[PDB]
Design an enzyme around this catalytic site. Structure first.
Site, short mmCIF file in Angstrom:
data_model
loop_
_atom_site.label_atom_id
_atom_site.label_comp_id
_atom_site.label_asym_id
_atom_site.label_seq_id
_atom_site.Cartn_x
_atom_site.Cartn_y
_atom_site.Cartn_z
N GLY A 11 0.78 -1.21 0.00
CA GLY A 11 0.00 0.00 0.00
C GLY A 11 0.81 1.26 0.00
N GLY A 12 0.11 2.40 0.12
CA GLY A 12 0.78 3.71 0.10
C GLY A 12 1.72 3.88 1.28
CB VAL A 13 1.50 3.32 4.95
CG1 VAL A 13 2.55 3.21 6.07
CG2 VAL A 13 0.65 4.58 5.16
CG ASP A 149 -0.06 11.62 16.31
OD1 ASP A 149 -0.50 12.10 15.23
OD2 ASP A 149 -0.74 10.78 16.98
NE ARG A 152 1.12 14.50 10.54
CZ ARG A 152 0.11 13.68 10.30
NH1 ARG A 152 -0.58 13.18 11.30
NH2 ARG A 152 -0.10 13.26 9.06
CG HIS A 187 -3.13 8.65 15.35
ND1 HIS A 187 -2.14 9.56 15.11
CD2 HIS A 187 -3.73 8.43 14.16
CE1 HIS A 187 -2.08 9.83 13.82
NE2 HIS A 187 -3.03 9.13 13.21
#
Ligand code: NAD
Ligand code: NAD
Ligand code: OAA
Ligand code: OAA
Lengths: 338, 339
Positions: A11-13, A149, A152, A187
């Site tokens: 997948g994208g991740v 998180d 970020r 999250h």
């Protein structure tokens, strides 16, 4: 030494996560599984000149993938897209995490399970309760990956200091800001609690502090918007998730974690200091929270509650808001499977 | 220190390539450009806690993408597909390289241009002949990224050793094996030339030599086949491409390259010892070859020819067949511009 499996590798991740894990010196075999395309992706990454063997497996081959694994990353799941409600996402992802975790319980019941699938706040409980049902639950071995998180927060603390105060922001290095900020809670935007541990910095942000908080909390929404409906964070999740996996991997080779106060969403009642964490967050029966953890052989052996001991009034209020959402998120998880 | 732009950043190669470039401590500004999706991908990467500032740009913003860029990576292209003829593949990628290289010539004429697009053997001559026509061509600054060939060689050298002699297979570090194998020539099965330096590795290989040599040369195919027609190598390319860009970027900061005998597909006549290389490959007018380079400040300042001076009867045989096909690859690209 250590076999890693990745369930949802295509997948994208999952792809860039698989790429970053092929580059890890702590990995000896890397196994990739998905419902499609994993064999080609594994072959692709087997050309890379790093020491790990990398095989991908077909959809019928989860057992070969899982057999003998010590760490299982789960980027599998359905991401946000315009045609889809949170409740859509919740139910589809709950089915995926259940099947994959049942597969873990059967084929490698002792592996450290790192859940990336969102919503982490309810799917971790699904993971746990699935394993408990199976007689296979080890509390040190189930982790919601909330580390994006923290990534970020680190990034945005530097970006907000640059804006306010090009003086102070110069001396900030994004790669080491985990010394100055820690993220706890859950999250989702209601549950993410950024805790700046450097109180000088809180003051220097001034009126940019509330923006910083909000930015960390809604970072998910920000990428969904940037990607113009169709897509959520992928590449940076891959990064964050490989960073966390690398701390879990480090801990098999008796090495100090590089992130100070590395947090994951864990089952409080089964872990040392969990009861103290419960009290400190103001709720004596809450079963899960993302908190700084201590790892040995890829298992959580304690929770470090220090960050809960020096909360500002503002942060207390964030905790309170988080707790009440989290209780509902957890109950929605457990009750889907009970 | 340096601004990097990636043209084609949203593709199979481009997204992972961009992620790895986001992690480089050598990059000040990372700019991403594609016909689609580059803004969201830049925003995604901007959240990563490394110091580079990452911005993506829409299809009509190549101007702001390229402004002050000193290094330009070009993963843009059409890959191999079950449908496509050699010639139709070539046509599509030729137009894309001409078009993006024109923009470089127009908005960042000093940039080091790193061409990942395939066929490298023809697309690099198109970029050069485009730049010449604009009067913006510097020979030190155009490099076809052939690094994935080295990467596969390093890796298949060990895979093949293991199956022959595990005692020695296990003694090797897949990661530092650019001291024991160096790849030269072009980027295609007929043009890739793995030179196992450290010769007694060749006798252990025994009849696995011709098998190994072939595995490296046909690595691309192997991935295409393994992905069952639907894609070619992406993630290993992003890796090999990012390593290569790192050596480029490293040479901006007075640092030795980490890769010994680091090769790239370069324009011989414009480059120190380019004449010496042509002689040594047995073709006085061959304008391109992938050979070890020396980088000063992002730019190729010399070709190191050592590796051509000592060649097996088999290796000269490989040079021979590569040169014959490369002449046609180079002519196929030059004529696309010289028409
Ligand atoms: N924890 C975080 O901070 C965070 C951040 C970003 C995204 N996410 C989440 O990560 C998940 C993946 O997002 P993506 O953007 O990579 O989505 P995606 O749809 O691109 O990829 C998910 C992959 O999972 C695979 N999959 C589905 N069911 C499977 C099964 N039973 N077994 C194995 N594989 C299966 C799919 O085939 C696909 O390859 C989503 O749930 C998303 O919400 C979490
Ligand atoms: N040098 C090597 O060893 C090597 C290795 C693997 C792949 N490749 C080549 O790299 C290229 C990319 O393959 P891929 O798998 O990423 O393909 P893809 O189709 O997944 O990616 C192509 C990307 O290029 C973009 N693009 C096309 N024209 C453009 C333009 N004019 N401006 C900006 N962007 C543009 C597309 O929008 C897309 O995002 C192919 O030509 C492929 O053969 C080279
Ligand atoms: O927002 C989403 O759905 C994906 C996610 O968890 C994030 O990027 O934080
Ligand atoms: O083979 C292809 O089409 C892409 C490529 O250049 C490679 O993987 O070497």
């Amino acid at each position: 030494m250590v076999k890693v499996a990745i369930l949802g590798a295509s997948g994208g991740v999952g792809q860039p996560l698989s790429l970053l894990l092929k580059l890890s010196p702590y990995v000896s075999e890397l196994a990739l599984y998905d419902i499609r395309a994993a064999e080609g992706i594994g072959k692709d990454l087997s050309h890379i000149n790093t020491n790990s063997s990398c095989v991908g497996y077909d959809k019928d081959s989860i057992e070969n993938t899982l057999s003998n694994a010590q760490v299982v990353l789960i980027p599998a799941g359905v991401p946000r897209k315009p045609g889809l409600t949170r409740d859509d996402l919740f139910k589809m992802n709950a089915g995926i995490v259940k099947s994959l975790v049942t597969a873990v319980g059967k084929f490698a019941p002792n592996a450290r399970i790192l859940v990336i699938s969102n919503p982490v706040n309810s799917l971790v409980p699904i993971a746990v309760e699935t394993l408990k049902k199976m007689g296979k639950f080890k509390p040190g071995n189930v982790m919601g990956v909330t580390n994006l998180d923290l990534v970020r927060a680190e990034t945005f603390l530097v970006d907000y200091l640059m804006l306010k105060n090009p003086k102070i922001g110069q001396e900030q290095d994004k790669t080491t800001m985990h010394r100055k900020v820690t993220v706890i809670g859950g999250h989702s935007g209601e549950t993410i609690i950024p805790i700046i541990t450097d109180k000088s910095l809180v003051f220097q942000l001034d009126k940019q502090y509330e923006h910083f908080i909000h930015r960390v909390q809604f970072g998910g929404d920000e990428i969904v918007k940037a990607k113009q409906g169709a897509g959520s964070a992928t590449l940076s999740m891959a990064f964050a998730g490989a960073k966390f996996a690398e701390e879990v991997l480090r801990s098999f080779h008796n090495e100090k974690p590089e992130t100070e106060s590395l947090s994951a969403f864990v089952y409080l009642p089964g872990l040392k200091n969990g009861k103290k964490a419960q009290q400190l967050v103001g709720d004596n029966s809450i079963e899960y929270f993302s908190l700084p953890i201590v790892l040995r052989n890829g298992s959580v052996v304690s929770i470090d509650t220090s960050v809960l001991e020096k909360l500002s009034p503002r942060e207390e209020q964030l905790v309170n808001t988080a707790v009440k959402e989290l209780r509902k998120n957890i109950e929605k998880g457990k009750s889907f499977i009970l």
